[PDB]
Amino acid sequence: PFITVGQENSTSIDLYYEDHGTGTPVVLIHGFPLSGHSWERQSAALLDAGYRVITYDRRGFGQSSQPTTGYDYDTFAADLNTVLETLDLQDAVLVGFSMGTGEVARYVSSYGTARIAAVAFLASLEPFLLKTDDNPDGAAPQEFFDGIVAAVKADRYAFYTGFFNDFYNLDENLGTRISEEAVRNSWNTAASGGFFAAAAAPTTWYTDFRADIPRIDVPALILHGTGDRTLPIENTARVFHKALPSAEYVEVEGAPHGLLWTHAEEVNTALLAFLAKAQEAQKQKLLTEVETYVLSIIPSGPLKAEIAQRLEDVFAGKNTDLEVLMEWLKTRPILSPLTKGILGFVFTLTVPSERGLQRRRFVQNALNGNGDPNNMDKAVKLYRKLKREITFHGAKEISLSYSAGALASCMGLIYNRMGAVTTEVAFGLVCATCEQIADS
Amino acid sequence: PFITVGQENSTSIDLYYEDHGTGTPVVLIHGFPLSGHSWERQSAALLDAGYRVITYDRRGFGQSSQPTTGYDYDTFAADLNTVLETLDLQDAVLVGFSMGTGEVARYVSSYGTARIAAVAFLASLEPFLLKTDDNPDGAAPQEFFDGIVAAVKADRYAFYTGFFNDFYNLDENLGTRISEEAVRNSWNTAASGGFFAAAAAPTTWYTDFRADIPRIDVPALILHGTGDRTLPIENTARVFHKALPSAEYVEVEGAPHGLLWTHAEEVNTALLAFLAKAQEAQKQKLLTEVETYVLSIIPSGPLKAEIAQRLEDVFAGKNTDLEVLMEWLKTRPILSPLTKGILGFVFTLTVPSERGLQRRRFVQNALNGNGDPNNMDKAVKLYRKLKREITFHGAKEISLSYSAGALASCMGLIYNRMGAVTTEVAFGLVCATCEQIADS
Amino acid sequence: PFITVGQENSTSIDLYYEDHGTGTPVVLIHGFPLSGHSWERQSAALLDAGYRVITYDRRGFGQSSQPTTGYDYDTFAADLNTVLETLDLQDAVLVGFSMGTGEVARYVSSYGTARIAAVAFLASLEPFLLKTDDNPDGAAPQEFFDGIVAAVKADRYAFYTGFFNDFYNLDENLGTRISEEAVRNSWNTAASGGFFAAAAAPTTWYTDFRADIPRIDVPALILHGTGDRTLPIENTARVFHKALPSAEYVEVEGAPHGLLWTHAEEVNTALLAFLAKAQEAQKQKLLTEVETYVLSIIPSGPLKAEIAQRLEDVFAGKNTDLEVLMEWLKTRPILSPLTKGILGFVFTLTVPSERGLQRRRFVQNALNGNGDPNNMDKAVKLYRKLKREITFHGAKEISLSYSAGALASCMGLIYNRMGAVTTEVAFGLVCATCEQIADS
Amino acid sequence: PFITVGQENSTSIDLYYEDHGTGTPVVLIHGFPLSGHSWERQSAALLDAGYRVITYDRRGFGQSSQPTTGYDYDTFAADLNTVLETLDLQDAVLVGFSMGTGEVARYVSSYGTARIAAVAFLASLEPFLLKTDDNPDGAAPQEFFDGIVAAVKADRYAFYTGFFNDFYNLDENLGTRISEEAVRNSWNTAASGGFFAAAAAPTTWYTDFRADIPRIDVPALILHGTGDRTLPIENTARVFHKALPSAEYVEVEGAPHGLLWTHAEEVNTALLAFLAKAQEAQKQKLLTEVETYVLSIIPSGPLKAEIAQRLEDVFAGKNTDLEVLMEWLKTRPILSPLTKGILGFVFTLTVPSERGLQRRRFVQNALNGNGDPNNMDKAVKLYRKLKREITFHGAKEISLSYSAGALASCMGLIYNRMGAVTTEVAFGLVCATCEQIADS
Secondary structure, eight states: OOEEEETTTEEEEEEEEESOOOOOSEEOOOOTOOGGGGGGGHHHHHHTTTOOOEOOTTTSSSOOOOOOSSOHHHHHHHHHHHHHHHOOOEEEEEETTTTTHHHHHHHHHHOOOTTTEEEESSSSSOSBBOOOOTTTTTOOOHHHHHHHHHHHHHHHHHHHHHHHHTTTTTHHHHHHHHHHHHHHHHHHHHHHHHHHHHHGOOOOOOTTTTTTTGGHHHHHEEETTTTTTOOOTTTHHHHHHHOOSSEEEEEEEEOOHHHHHHHHHHHHHHHHHHHHHHHHHHHHHHHHHHHHHHTTOOSSSHHHHHHHHHHHHHHHTTTHHHHHHHHHHHOOOSOOHHHHHHHHHHHHHSSSSSTOOOOHHHHHHSSSSSTTTHHHHHHHHHHHHHOOSSSSHHHHHTTTSSSHHHHHHHHHHHHTSSOOOOOOHHHHOOOOOOOHHHHH | OOEEEEETEEEEEEEEEESSSSSSSEEEEOOOOOOOOHHHHHHHHHHHOEEEEEEOOOOTTTSSOOOOOOHHHOOOOOOOOHHHHHHTTEEEEEEEETHHHHHHHHHHHHOOOTTEEEEEEESSOSSSOOOSSSSOOOSSSHHHHHHHHHHHHHHHHHHHHHHHHTTHHHHBBBTTTHHHHHHHHHOOOOOOHHHHHHHGGGTTOOOOOOTTTTOOSOEEEEEEEOOOOOOTTTTHHHHHHHHHHEEEEEETTTTTHHHHHHHEEEEEHHHHHHHHOOOOOOOHHHHHHHHHHTTSSSSSSSHHHHHHHHHHHHHHTTTOOEEEEEEEETOOTTOOOOHHHHHHHHEEEEEOOOOOOOHHHHHHTTTOTTEEEEHHHHHHHHEEEEEEEESHHHHHHHHHHHOOOHHHHHHHHHTTTTTOOOOHHHHHHHHHHHHHHHHH | OEEEEEEETTTEEEEEEEESSSSSEEEEETTTTTOOGGGHHHHHHHHHOOOEEEEEEOOOOOTTTOSSSSSSHHHHHHHHHHHHHHHOSSEEEEEEEHHHHHHHHHHHHHHOSSSSEEEEEEOOOSSOEEEEEEEEEEEBOHHHHHHHHHHHHHHHHHHHHHHHHHHTTTTBBBBBBHHHHHHHHHHHHHSSSSSHHHHTTHHOOOOOOTGGGGGOOEEEEEEEEEEEESSSSHHHHHHHHHHOTTEEEEETTOSSOOHHHHHHHHHHHHHHHHHHHHHHHHHHHHHHHHHHHHHHTSSSHHHHHHHHHHHHHHEEEEEEEOOHHHHHHHHHTOOOOOHHHHHHHHHHSSSSTTOOOOOOOOHHTTSSSSSHHHHHHHHHHHHHHHSSSOOOOHHHHHHHTTHHHHHHHHHHHHHTOOHHHOOOHHHHHHHHHHHHHOOO | OOEEEEEEESSEEEEEEEEEESSEEEEEOOOOOOOOOGGHHHHHHHHHHOOOOEOOOOOTTTOOOSSSSOOOHHHHHHHHHHHHHHHHHSSEEEEETTHHHHHHHHHHHOTTTTTTEEEEEEEEOOOOOOOSOOTTTTTHHHHHHHHHHHHHHHHHHHHHHHHHHTTHHHHHHHTTOOOOOHHHHHHHHHHHHHHHHHHHHGGGTTTOOOOTTTOOSSSSSEEEEETTTSSSSOOOOOOHHHHHHTOOOEEEEETTHHHHHHTTTHHHHEEEEEHHHHHHHHHHHHHHHHHHHHHTTSSSSSSHHHHHHHHHHHTTOOOOOHHHHHHHHHTTTTTHHHHHHHHHHHHHHHOOTTTTTOOOHHHHSSSSOTOOOOHHHHHHHHHHHHHHHOOHHHHHHTTTOOOHHHHHHHHHHHHTTSOOOHHHHHHHHHHHHHHHTTTT
C-alpha cells in the first residue's frame, strides 16, 4: 500500500502506509529511524478497542520511497496532509512519536484541525531542541546535532547499534523490558531506511515548533519518559507542558526514548484512556446542544422538565431501560406525535444498548411523512447529501433547505434502518427538524 | 509479482507470487512463518526436472500484504483459488507444507480438482490437531494453542528464535543439516511477516480437515518427518494415512518439521518420483479419454467395435503394423472421411515407430478443411496457442472455442509436419474436435 | 522505482532503480551479490559534487525481480540499455564494479557510446577471467568457478559469510576499514537476492570481454585494488590496462575487492577527479547555449558586447557584485524592459551567492506579464509541467508551446519564489522565451 | 457482382465485374463488342500462375448496365478509376484489348500509376486511328468510321456476323483455331450488349491517345497480331512501339484481331512471361531496399560486410542452409540482440524453404519488446493496421508513427505466427523499425 506525495527525477515519491480495523481513524506517525511497524504494540491495542489504525512510513524510512530531497517539517507535514486527504479522514486522531510529534504540530499549524479530532505527543520534540541564547530551554547546541549527522555519514550501520543503546536504555531494559531479538529487528529496520534520509533527518530534530503550538486547539496529550536520554524530559515535554497547559500531561517513570515497546503497558493505557475521554468530551458538547434544540419544540411546563431530566440522565450514563422510556414516551398526553417521533429517534440514538428492542411502532407512524410519495422523494435527495456529510454543523445547515415534512420523513428513513449516516449527522438532521418547528 | 486476492479498506490485499520454468505447473504453498522462498531447495530441483514452479506468499507473510482480517482456511483457500484462476493453470500440482497442507485440502474440498492433477502433503496438519474427547487423535489440548498465541503477542521476535529451535531440531541438525546463516535468514523472514498474522495464524492450525479429506480424488502424496516436534508424526500423518490409504506414503527417518531444508535430499527424491508416477498415471487416463471421444463420433455397429479394439491394442503395446492399420482404415465402408482422418491422426501419434511411412494421402485430404482460406486462418490462430500449451486439459479447453471445421483443419496442419506440439496438446486438439462433431 | 526490462511467464521482469540529484547523469552498476545501495559511499559523494546519481539492481539482486532465466552479459547489457533508453540519458557516465564492469563493456561494445560520455571500470573483470591455453593471463581455471556454483547451490546463506570474508579482506579491515554492522547489512542484501541468480552469476564471471574492449572510444578509467582477492590485480586490471593504454589507470594500495566501502576515500577522490574533467565541459556548453539565446534578443551594438562579456565573466567564476550587475542593467538605455527582466533572471540564476539581495523591483514589473489573468492562467499551467521536468532540452521544448506573454509571466512566477524548478529547467524556460522574442 | 460508377435519373450505372484468385491483381479490360468472359482463356492461365484475376464489363456491354450517355475515354477511364479505388487495388497490372487499351492509356495518363505496377496493350488502338493530314499514320479516314456506325444503327444483329468474320479471320481460322460453337457464343454476347453502346463505341475508336502515351512510366508490353484486320499492325502497334521503345514488343505471327482465343497459346506465354518479369522486378527493388535499411543499424566493420554478403546470396538464389545462417548469426560478437532478431526475421522471410526448422529461440527473446504490456498494446494496434495493408511503402509509412519498442514487439508478433501479413508488408515493418534505430 503506497501513497504518492511527491516526485523525484524519473521516479515518483511513494509512501508505504497501512490502514486496518474499523471505527475512529487513528493516524500513527513513527520516529527515527524506525517505520510504521514499530507501532505494533499500540496497533494491536487500538485495534482491540475498535479503532481504525492508520500508519505510514516517513520518506526515506521503512518501505517508503527514498528520495534525496524534501527533508523538512514543512515537507513532512505536506506528506501527512496528502495521506489524510487521500484517505479523506474525518474526526481523525494524530498520534506522534519522536520525529512524529513534529509532523503533528506542523500539520495542525499549517493545514488546520479540520479533519483532526484530537492529538497526542509521545516523546515530543516540542517546543525547540536547539539551545541558543534566546532559547535557553534547548536540549543541545548546534555543534551536537552536527556531530550526529557526521556520525551517521561515517558509518550509518554502526551508528544504529550505538543509537539503539540509548533508545531503549539497554543497560536497564535489555532482556527484561526489551528482548535481544526485538532490538535486532529495530536495527534491520534502521538499515532498510534510505542512506540519505538517515543523515538528513537529524538536522530536522532541532526545528522551532514554538510557532506551531498555539495552533493546537483540539484536545491534546503529552506523554514522555523520565529516563529519555535522546530527548531530556526537562528540555522537551516539561517545557512543552508550560506552552500547552490545556493538554493532558503524563510522565512515565524511568521510561527510555522508545517507551512504545519497553513500557507498552503504560503507554497503551494512557493513550486509550485519552482517546476515550476525548470521544466522550466532544460527544457531550454535542448531546447538550441537541438537547436545547429538542427542548425548543416542547411547551414550557412540568413535562418539559421531565423530558429534559430524562435526556440529561441518558447523556450522563444513568442508563434507563430503553423499553421503559419508550413506554413512558408513547403514553404522554399533550405531546405532538411528531415530537414523540423526534424524541424516540433521539433516545434510540443516544442509549448505549438497544437491548434487542425492535423499532417502536409509534415512532414509525410519526416519521412516516404522511405516507406522501412527494415527501419521500425529497427525503431520498436529502439522504444522499447526508451520506457524504460527517459533521454536525455541515449536515444540519444543508438540511434546513428541505421542508419540515421532508425532514420528518427523512428521519424515519434512517430510523427504519433504510438509511445510514454518522451519529453526528443524524443529530444535525434532528436539530434542523426542531429548528423548523421552533419557527411556527 | 503480485496478485490481488482481496481488499482491506482503502488498501488491496495483494499476494507476492512467483512463476518460473516451463512445463507442468507445480504450485508450492509454504508454512508458518516463512515464505515462498523457503521452497528454494525444492524449486531448484523441480526446475532441473523441467517443471513449472509457481510459489506465492500467504497473506500476512513474506512480501504479501499484511491485512488484519481473514485468517481462516476458507479465506486461505479462496486466496489460493484466485491465484490458480488468474494464471489459468491446467493439470497443475498442489504441494503444501505445514499450514500449506491445509490450503490444499480445503481448496480441493471446496473448489474441486478441475485444475488439479495431483496433490502433495508435506508435514501435514490433517486431519485434526485439536485434542478433544471426540477427537483423541489430537496433538495437543486447547490450552496449548492459546499459550502460543499469547507468547507471540508478547514478543513475536523473541518467539521466533525459540520456534525455529524446534522447527529444525537445531540441537541435532545445526552445523550439519542446516547452517547457522540459514537459520538467521529464516528468522528475518519470520520478522518480515505481519505482526497480526503471526498471532492469528496459530489459531488456524487446529482446523478440522476431516471433512475435506474424502474430497481428494487426484493422486496424492503424504510425506512427513518422524522427528517432527511441532507436528507429531502419529497425531498427524499416520492418522492422515488412514483417512487416505490410496495416497503415496513416505516417512523420512529422523527428519524435523522443516525437512524442506534439512532433508532436502530425501524430499526432492520422493517428490520427483511421485510427480513422475502421477503424470504417467493420468497419461494412461488420457488415452482412455481419447478413445471415448473418438468413439463418440462413430455410428454404433460392428465396425465401431473393431475400431475401439484396434485403439485399445495400440494404446496397450500390441504394436500393429502401421501400414496395415492405415490400409484397413482407408478401405472401410460406412466411415466418414473426416472420421478416417481423425483416426489416422491418432494412429500416427500413438504407434511407437513410424517405420519410414510417408504421410498418408487419404488423411491429408480429409483434414484439409475444404480448402477454405478462412478455415485455415482460424486454424493458424489456434495452432499458435497450442504451441505454448503443454497440458491436455489446457490445450483441449482453449480449442473448444474454435469451429469444428477449423479444428479439423488445424489437425491436418499438424499432420503435414507444418506444426509441432507435445503429444498431450495434440490429444487435446483431438478430443476437442470429436466433441464438436458429437453435437451435430 | 522500477523499470521493466523483460518478461518471464505470468510475471514481468522489473529492475529496482533509483535516480537522484540534478546534473550530469552517472549510472552506477553494482557487483555480486550486493545491490545499488552499496554505492551509498559514492552516491553521497557524487551528489555532493552536483552529479545526477542513477543506480539500479541487476536482475535477481536487491529489490529487482528474481527470474530464473537470462543470466548472461548479452542479457545484462540489454537490461542496462532498457534502463538507459527509458530514462533517455544523454552524455551519461557508466561506472561499473565487479560484475558491473562487464555490463559497461558489453553495452559499449554492442550498443555503442551514443549516450555515453565516459566510462569507469572499478575492480574489473576484463579482459578474461577463465584461464585457458589460449588465455594464460586468466586468473583461475574452469574448475575454480564450477566450485563456487556448487558451493552456492549447497548453502548460499553460509556461502555469503565466507564470500564477504574475502570481499572486504576482513582479516585486515574488519573493525577498522569496515565495521561489523556494515558487513551484517551486506549479508542481508546477499540473502535478499534470488536463490537462482546467486548460483547463475558465477558462471558469468569468466566471460570473454576481449572483443568488447576495442569498442571503448570515450575516455575511460581503470581502478583496482592490489589486495583484491576475488579478482587478482595482475590477472585482471594490469592486463586490461595493456589492452587499453589510453584509459586513466589507478591502483589503490592495499585495497580489497570491496574497495567501494573500505577505501571509499581513495575511490571517491579518483572517481570525482576523472569525472571532473567531463562535468565542466558539459556545464559550460549549457551556459554558452543560454548566452547565445540571451544575446539573440539584444540589438547589435557596443552594449551587446558588454552583456556578452559580463555573462562570460560570471560563467567563468569572476564573480562580480550581483548588486553592481543589476545596477548597471537597469540604468541601460536602448534595452527592452522584458530584456532587462530576462537578464536579471539569468544573473540571479548563475551567480553562486544571492548575497542577501532582495528580489529586484524592476525585474518583477518586467516579468509581471501585463498583469493579465489570462497570461497567468497559462503560466500556472506551464509551471505545473515545468515542475516535473529535469532536462534542458525537455523543459525548453515544452515551453515553446506557450505564448510569449505566458513565458514571461511564468518566468517571474519562478522569480518571485512562487515556483520551484531545477536550474537546467529554468534555463530552458529562458531560452524558450528568448526564442519567441527572436521571431518577432 | 456489380460496382456503381455513375448515375442516371432512375437507373444507376452498375458494371458487372469479377475478382478471383489470390495474389498480384491483374485487371483485364475486354474489347468490342464482347465482355469480360472473353478472357476465360487468359483468366484460367493467370490463375494457374497464382495471380489475382480481375475482369469487368465496360458500360453498355455484357452484364453491365446499358446507359445511353458517357461513351468517351475520359468517362471510360473514370469508370475504371472507380473500379480500382473501390477494390483498393495496389501494385496492379492493367491489361487491355481492343477498346480496352485506350482505357489503360487514358487512366494512367490522367490519374497516374499510383496503384499501377505495369501495363499491357493487346491489339492496341494507340496512338491514333483517324487518318488525317497531320496524322498520316492513321488506319482509316473519317468516312470509314461513319460507315460502321450507320451499319450498326441499320441492323446491329446482322452487323455482328459480318463483324466477327473479320474479328477472328474465320476464312482462315474457323474450324481450326476457333470452333463454330465458340463464335455462336460471341454473337450472343454481342447481342446482349446495349443497342446504343454498339453504335456509340465505334466513334470512340479514333480517339487521339498521343498526349497520353508519354505518361506511361511503368514497365509495358505491346502485343499484337499481324493478321489483325480491324486494327492494322502497322497503323497501330508498330507506330506505338516507336512512341514507346522501352515497352516490351511482341508480334504474334498470323494472328487475327481476336487473338485472345485463336492464339490464346501465344498470348498466355507472352503475358505470363511479362508479368513474371514485372512481379520479380518490384521484389528485387524491395530486397535491395530492405538490405540498405538493415545494414543502416549495423556498426561499420568487417562484420557489416559479411552480413551484407550473406543477404545478397539469399536474395539471389544461392540458398544457404537456414540452420547454418541462424547458427552463424547467433554466435556473432559485437552485434546487438535486437539486430540479431531483425536479421533472423529477414532470413526466415526470404529463404524459400523453412526446412521444418522450428522458430529460433534467440529471435523470440530479442523481439519480445521488453515484455512491457504497453509495448504489446501498441503492437496489436499497429498489427491491426498492417493486416489491411498490402504495399511496402503503405505499411512502412504508417509504422513510422509507432515507437521503436512497439515496432520491435510487433515484428516478433508476426515471427511467432501470432500475426499474418503479406511479405511486402512485413518488409515494410522491418524497414520502419530499422529507420528508428538509425536515428539514435
